[PDB]
Amino acid sequence: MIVPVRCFSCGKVVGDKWESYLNLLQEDELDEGTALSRLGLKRYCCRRMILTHVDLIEKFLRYNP
């Protein structure tokens, strides 16, 4: 269920980084740790935000209504 805007712990904006992260993983065929670092997600509080996120919205958008 959709990328949180901002890291809970520090407040760093993370909601603009999801699509770029998926691309870094798929298109550039990079590993999660270097993908996170390329996004400028240096601290572990910001890293858990994205790496740990589960995008259920995709599943939800599948329901026909």
The binding site consists of 7, 10, 45-46
Q: Please tell me whether residue 38 binds another protein under the rule CB under 8 A.
A: no
| Rounded Cα distance, 45 and 3, in Å | 14
Return d(Cα 5, Cα 58) in angstroms, integer. 17
Q: Segment 2-61, which members bind Zn ion (CB under 5 A)?
A: 7, 9-10, 12, 45-46
Q: How far is the CB of 63 from another protein (least distance, A)?
A: 8
Residues 12, 6 contacting (CB under 8 angstroms): yes
11 binds, among another protein, Zn ion, none (CB under 5 to 8 A by kind): another protein
